[PDB]
């Protein structure tokens, strides 16, 4: 019962900064916690970051330093920003909502590619 929405990514500079978002409704968003895996050409799907309700983060390793996670309750969105990007960063980007009220367990983004280029 709860729709995500993706924004931002595309393409950017190695060394650069881009910030993806995900908005989502039919849920409660404020008790549930968002986040991202990714899909990079030679891999499968891995975790990259995830925020409590209570605005606790976690990071991969792979972009432990690099990316920040933070959310709006107002706006029902939760943000990637990313920072230092490198080539080994491009990939399709999902947003994840894990569920704790009403609906399915866990919903899942359709998925934004991110593609880092030369400086
Ligand atoms: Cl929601
Ligand atoms: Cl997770
Ligand atoms: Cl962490
Ligand atoms: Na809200």
């Known amino acids: 019962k709860v729709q995500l929405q993706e924004s931002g990514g595309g393409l950017v500079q190695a060394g650069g900064s881009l910030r993806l978002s995900c908005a989502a409704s039919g849920g409660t968003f404020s008790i549930n916690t968002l986040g991202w895996y990714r899909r990079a050409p030679g891999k499968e799907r891995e975790f990259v970051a995830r925020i409590s309700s209570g605005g606790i983060t976690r990071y991969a390793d792979s972009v432990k330093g690099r990316f920040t996670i933070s959310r709006d309750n107002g706006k029902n969105t939760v943000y990637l920003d990313m920072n230092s990007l490198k080539p080994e960063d491009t990939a399709v980007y999902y947003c994840?909502?894990?569920?704790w009220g009403g609906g399915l367990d866990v919903y899942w983004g359709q998925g934004t590619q991110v593609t880092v280029s030369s400086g």
């Open positions: 994840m909502y894990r569920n």
